[PDB]
């Protein structure tokens, strides 16, 4: 059982190295590669306005949280259209252009296939490369993304420091983007971090006799800075070492708090009163969570994501407990959080909100859950955990096109790990010795033992 | 005297705001901008080989400090020429392309006019947009082309060490004082790459082969040049930094990955970083007096170690020149601090002597036909601050010594410098403004110091017969 605690720590590091897991070199292949945005090009401005309507209906959350005013956005949109029409420059206009493009791209990532397929032009499909479903949708999404990225890479360095770049990155983080083009994303993250510390956005310390505009400015600054620290913890592999989550110690605050509990879980001093206080505090925050009442799509979405974060972090905390200090009944008390998560994703399937399921955070979550569940399913027996893990993996294979390489890689190495069950099924065990070798293989990839090595070579 | 101390504090802030004193905002303008580099474009193969020969002759300093072997460079050069001819890709080839291009541009900035003008082709002048002005315009065109190429291939790339070299190879130019915000941003990216690769592992270990030693040596030189620039280029436009990760050479009394010094190596990159750290401890951290005594003793010792370098070739004179320049500059800053704050006697004359040494040096390097070596931006920063303070205390007090030294500095600087036209022009105009301020004060919370209070307030808000006094204020 002490062996269990140690090998649970080993599984922690192995999951760490899990989570520490084409686009061209010279930005010149995409020098003249087609838009989607022109009058004759791909999408018909009015369809775009409809897209914006759908975005503002369901998903105000992100950009409502950031900006000050949002009629601003259709306003700027129509202004650019008029200006585009008049043209048949400056910094502001180009930023706003990129802003609306990224907004649209987010909307694309959270649209149904058939709809957009009805929107897109036809001879423009003949103009462009095909893939002809969701695969077509994701190929056109990828083309739009790469085009936007071409546009933004050039235009990032050559500019004064303005807030809106940050907005771009944040609008684009809610996608497959960072887990498919990681190093790119990390560098732009570093630049955005520099812009963050530039502007003194830690002056959201709200002061006296400030105007409502000023309150909204400081609120935007607050939400942005804290979302930035959120991502900067969640996306902090050894590829990046510069950070802002060290500078810490409205429910944006709440999400950052939850991230800080996860941080304190991972890196710092594990005590027991610490965990007791954290878990009470998180129940308190669940109270504060359920205070939100169902009244509209964005609200269901937000409360879903918050409850998801809360149960995920509770699952991590209670895991930490049962690995390090071995309290009893914790396996079942850990399985219950998973069931809550799964009731939530069930709600968001049954309500025809499967597109909302496609957030990468959910997939990271299911990844780690299925990971630990497979671990303790092969090392120990509990039909509950087995059943849940089977649900998770059948779900993830049958439902997810977007993150095709990662899930498939995970699935393939996961299927490899089922053969490792047979090994352990066929005591400093050779299986834990194999896992020592495996963590060593990964850490060095960063920069009947005969038969055991035989099956290793086979896989 | 207390008034002197206070206005000297004002001069501290005013020199910061002195030094806190086109590019298209869109790369696609250079989407189709031709080259200088094809066989027929501007610069023949042979001209380029000649450029590299002159570079290794005169200015080995930089890239000698960085790389391991340098016959590597002509080797890769000729290989790239062969591959270009065969093509009429990869990462290595494009990196090496950028490397040689930047090397060249540095060499252009440190070439004599007549030579390059003899090398360059002719009808390509008709192809392209069009003394020193021709040299600097063609240099600027080459620079902007290289910058387009390298921005693209910077972002879209894995993390490799050689990118860093590019920036360092290019920092020794007008670049950072002509394209500041750009430079600061790319500097942030290079800092990230530095901390990525663990180049703090120049901690030389046991039973390492010579290749490993040379790798760690290159890392070491890189790190210290990087810390040098990162302190030297640290306006409030930038707040992220790396000059904290090293540590002062001072051996303080009042006080891990934070690297210390004297424990590593002796290559004079270390010496430059030491000197910069002394300047740093002067500026930001606790100013004491025993501190200054120890610093001054240490700096005299290091001036000895500087002049130990003996004349045997151009690069050696260049390095020893820059080191003695830095040493006397820092001595001047220290002695300024002393004579400004606590009024120790004879420090003014012992301060004037360093300026005379500096000016004898630059006189030697003009008279020897080495004016190109003078063009390093640090020298110009130095003369800027010197002329600033000398004008300050020349208008507030009278000493024909000071008048002579300041007149020498400013006549020199005006008569000799086109390159950094924006910076020097801003400085010259505001300097003539301060000369009109001399006329004012010559014709006690004085209205003149009150006007300078107004000026610092104007600047601080630019971050994000009092009737006649305001009249002349509006006039200037």
């Amino acid at each position: 059982n002490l062996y269990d605690k140690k090998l649970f720590n080993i599984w922690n590091q192995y999951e760490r190295l899990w989570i520490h897991d084409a686009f061209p070199l010279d930005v010149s292949e995409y020098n003249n590669t087609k838009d989607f945005y022109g009058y004759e090009c791909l999408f018909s401005k009015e369809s775009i306005f409809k897209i914006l309507d759908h975005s503002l209906e369901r998903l105000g959350w992100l950009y409502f949280g950031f900006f000050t005013d949002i009629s601003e956005l259709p306003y700027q949109m129509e202004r650019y259209w008029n200006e585009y029409e008049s043209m048949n420059k400056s910094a502001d206009q180009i930023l706003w252009d990129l802003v609306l493009r990224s907004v649209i791209v987010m909307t694309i990532y959270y649209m149904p296939a058939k709809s957009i397929l009805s929107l897109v032009d036809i001879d423009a499909i003949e103009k462009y490369p095909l893939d002809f479903e969701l695969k077509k949708k994701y190929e056109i999404f990828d083309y739009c993304l790469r085009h936007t990225l071409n546009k933004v890479l050039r235009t990032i360095f050559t500019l004064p420091p303005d807030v809106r770049t940050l907005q771009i990155f944040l609008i684009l983080s809610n996608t497959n983007f960072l887990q498919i083009y990681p190093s790119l994303g990390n560098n732009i993250l570093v630049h955005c971090i520099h812009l963050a510390k530039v502007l003194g956005i830690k002056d959201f310390k709200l002061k006296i006799n400030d105007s409502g505009s000023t309150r909204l400015q400081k609120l935007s600054m607050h939400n942005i800075w804290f979302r930035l620290s959120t991502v900067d913890y969640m996306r902090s592999s050894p590829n990046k070492i510069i950070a802002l989550h060290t500078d810490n110690s409205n429910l944006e605050v709440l999400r950052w708090k939850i991230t800080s509990l996860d941080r304190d879980l991972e890196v710092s001093e594990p005590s027991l009163k610490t965990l007791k206080a954290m878990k009470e505090l998180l129940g308190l925050l669940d109270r504060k969570t359920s205070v939100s009442n169902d009244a509209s799509f964005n609200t269901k979405f937000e409360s879903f994501f918050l409850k998801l974060q809360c149960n995920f972090v509770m699952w991590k905390i209670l895991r930490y407990e049962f690995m390090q200090y071995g309290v009893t009944n914790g396996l079942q008390k850990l399985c219950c959080p998973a069931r809550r998560i799964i009731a939530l994703v069930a709600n968001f399937l049954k309500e025809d909100y499967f597109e909302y399921t496609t957030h990468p955070f959910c997939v990271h979550i299911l990844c780690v859950i299925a990971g630990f569940f497979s671990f303790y399913c092969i090392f120990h027996e509990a039909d509950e955990v087995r059943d849940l893990r089977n649900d998770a993996v059948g779900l993830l294979k049958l439902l997810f096109d977007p993150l095709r390489p990662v899930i498939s890689c995970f699935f393939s190495n996961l299927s490899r790990l089922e053969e490792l069950r047979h090994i352990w099924k066929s005591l400093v065990h050779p299986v834990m010795y194999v896992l020592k070798t495996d963590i060593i293989k990964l850490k060095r990839n960063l920069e009947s033992s005969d038969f055991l090595e035989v099956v290793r070579e086979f896989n | 005297n207390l008034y002197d101390k206070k206005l000297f504090n004002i001069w501290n802030q005013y020199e910061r705001l002195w030094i806190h004193d086109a590019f298209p905002l869109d790369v696609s303008e250079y989407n189709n901008t031709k080259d200088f580099y094809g066989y027929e474009c501007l610069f023949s193969k042979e001209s380029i080989f000649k450029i590299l020969d002159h570079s290794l002759e005169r200015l080995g300093w930089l890239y000698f400090g960085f790389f391991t072997d340098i016959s590597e460079l002509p080797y890769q050069m000729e290989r790239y020429w062969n591959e270009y001819e065969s093509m009429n890709k990869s990462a290595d080839q494009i990196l090496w392309d950028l490397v040689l291009r930047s090397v060249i541009v540095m060499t252009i900035y440190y070439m004599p006019a007549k030579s390059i003008l003899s090398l360059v082709d002719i009808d390509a002048i008709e192809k392209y947009p069009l003394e020193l002005k021709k040299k600097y315009e063609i240099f600027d065109y080459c620079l902007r082309h290289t910058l387009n190429k390298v921005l693209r291939t910077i972002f879209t790339l894995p993390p490799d060490v050689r990118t860093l070299q590019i920036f360092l190879i290019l920092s020794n130019t007008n670049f950072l004082q002509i394209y500041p915000s750009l430079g600061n941003n790319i500097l942030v990216h290079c800092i990230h790459l530095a901390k990525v690769l663990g180049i703090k592992d120049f901690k030389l270990k046991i039973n390492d082969s010579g290749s490993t030693r040379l790798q760690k040596l290159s890392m070491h030189n890189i790190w210290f040049r990087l810390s040098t620039v990162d302190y030297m280029r640290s306006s409030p436009n930038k707040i992220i930094a790396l000059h904290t990760d090293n540590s002062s050479a001072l051996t303080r009394k009042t006080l891990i990955d934070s690297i210390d010094v004297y424990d590593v190596e002796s290559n004079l990159e270390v010496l430059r970083w030491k000197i910069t750290s002394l300047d740093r401890d002067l500026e930001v951290s606790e100013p004491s007096l025993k501190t200054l005594k120890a610093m001054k003793e240490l700096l005299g010792l290091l001036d000895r170690k500087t002049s130990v370098s003996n004349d045997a070739s151009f690069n050696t004179k260049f390095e020893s020149f820059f080191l003695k320049l830095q040493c006397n500059f820092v001595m001047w800053k220290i002695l300024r601090y002393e004579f400004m704050q606590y009024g120790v006697t004879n420090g003014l004359q012992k301060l004037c002597c360093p300026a005379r040494r500096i000016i004898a040096l630059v006189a030697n390097f003009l008279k020897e036909d080495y004016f190109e070596y003078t063009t390093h931006p640090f020298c110009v920063h130095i003369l800027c601050v010197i002329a600033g303070f000398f004008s300050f205390y020349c208008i507030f007090h009278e000493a024909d010594e000071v008048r002579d030294l300041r007149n020498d500095a400013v006549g020199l600087l005006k008569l000799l410098f086109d390159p950094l036209r924006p910076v020097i022009s801003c400085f010259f105009s505001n300097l003539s403004r301060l000369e009109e301020l001399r006329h004012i004060w010559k014709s006690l919370v004085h209205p003149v110091m009150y006007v300078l209070k107004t000026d610092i307030i104007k600047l601080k808000r630019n971050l994000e017969s009092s009737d006649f006094l305001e009249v002349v204020r509006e006039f200037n």
């Binding site: - | 030389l204 046991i206 390492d208 010579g210 891990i256 210390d260 004297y262 004491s288 606590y342 120790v344």
Partner: protein
């Protein structure tokens, strides 16, 4: 004269007072060796001898009281040394650079607090002044200061200082000294160990006896006495360190201080034997200061001296130029790295005259070319070589 002397700059006055280290009183007690000699110097002097100070301050003065007329001398000395503008600039300036000259700490007598300014060797008193007088002469602040424990200042007086800097005031003090009370007992430790919580300006300590050191510091003598030893949070907050006055530090001793972490400077004086091969240290501490002692035993460096060839040796210095001889070049670097790894957590070594070191000096050239290795003329060694 006075104002002529005060129309002058600071370096002049500094060197002058450096020659006048601390002799402000018109008298002086002896060392210990001069005690048993019955020769008393001379102090025949007379009145202006108030019975307000001889009775009060006797806890640090009445120890002696056995010579020609000394206390009236002392009394009028304390009287007249309240107006020496000489002394006021002495302190403004000595404070300006460094008060290695005057040791200046808190005191309480009659339940009345004052600030006393003493010698350094054992802090024989010279005078004292009130806080309000002191910072009317100067600027008031939490001006960091010193403190030490005597049989005069042990527990309740000490706890009186504690409760005063709680109730009336705030703990404006850093540095702690153990000058007497070598027993680890008679209430000094009992008082102070619960009292280092409001005590957060400091990094600095001073120690006296091998008994107190071995039974408090040298962490091999492990026990479970919680109030008898420190709380380890202060063991973090001790970047500096000082110690004196013992005979046999490391002769077959247990010299190791890994618990004494976040240390950054060591000072040692006034001893009679030492060996560095027993010595073990944390990281973070390279500043080593060492004062007049008897013969030192350097590191061994014997095997490494056997590794050497005269292939290269010149003038006490060495180098391989031959890149072709990686055999010799790698050997050179192996040698150099072994050398520094012996001294690994050290970069600065100061010696006053200790009269001898026995242990085959071979050092690096990077540091002796500078003034890192800073020996006085304790020039009784010959086995010198540099890298």
């Amino acid at each position: 004269d006075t104002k002529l002397f005060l129309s002058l700059p600071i370096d002049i006055r500094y060197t002058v007072y450096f020659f006048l280290g601390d002799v402000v009183q018109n008298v002086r007690p002896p060392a210990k060796s001069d005690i048993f000699n019955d020769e008393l110097i001379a102090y025949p002097n007379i009145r202006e001898f108030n019975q307000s100070l001889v009775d009060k301050y006797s806890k640090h003065i009445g120890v002696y009281d056995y010579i020609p007329n000394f206390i009236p001398n002392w009394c009028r000395d304390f009287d007249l040394l309240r107006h020496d503008i000489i002394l006021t600039d002495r302190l403004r300036v000595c404070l300006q650079y460094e008060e290695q000259w005057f040791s200046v700490q808190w005191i309480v007598v009659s339940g009345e607090l004052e600030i006393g300014i003493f010698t350094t060797d054992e802090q024989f008193l010279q005078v004292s002044y009130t806080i309000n007088e002191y910072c009317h002469l100067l600027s008031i602040a939490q001006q960091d200061l010193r403190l030490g424990i005597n049989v005069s200042d042990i527990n309740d007086v000490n706890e009186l200082c504690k409760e005063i800097q709680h109730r009336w005031l705030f703990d404006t003090v850093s540095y702690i000294s153990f000058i007497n009370c070598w027993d680890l007992d008679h209430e000094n430790v009992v008082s102070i160990i619960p009292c280092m919580e409001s005590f957060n300006n400091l990094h600095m300590l001073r120690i006296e006896s091998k008994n107190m050191f071995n039974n408090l510091i040298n962490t091999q003598g492990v026990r479970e006495n919680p109030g008898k030893t420190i709380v380890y949070n202060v063991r973090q907050n001790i970047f500096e360190l000082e110690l004196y006055t013992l005979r046999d530090l490391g002769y077959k001793s247990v010299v190791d201080l890994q618990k004494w972490e976040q240390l950054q400077c060591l000072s040692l004086s006034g001893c009679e034997f030492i060996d560095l091969n027993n010595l073990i240290l944390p990281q973070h501490c390279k500043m080593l200061i060492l004062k007049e002692v008897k013969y030192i035993i350097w590191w061994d460096l014997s095997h490494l001296l056997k590794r050497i060839r005269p292939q290269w040796i010149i003038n006490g210095q060495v180098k391989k130029p031959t890149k072709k001889e990686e055999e010799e070049e790698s050997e050179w670097y192996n040698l150099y790295l072994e050398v520094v790894q012996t001294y690994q957590p050290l970069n600065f070594i100061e010696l006053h005259n200790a009269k001898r070191v026995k242990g085959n000096l071979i050092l690096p050239a990077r540091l002796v070319t500078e003034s890192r290795i800073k020996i006085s003329n304790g020039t009784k060694v010959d086995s010198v070589l540099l890298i």
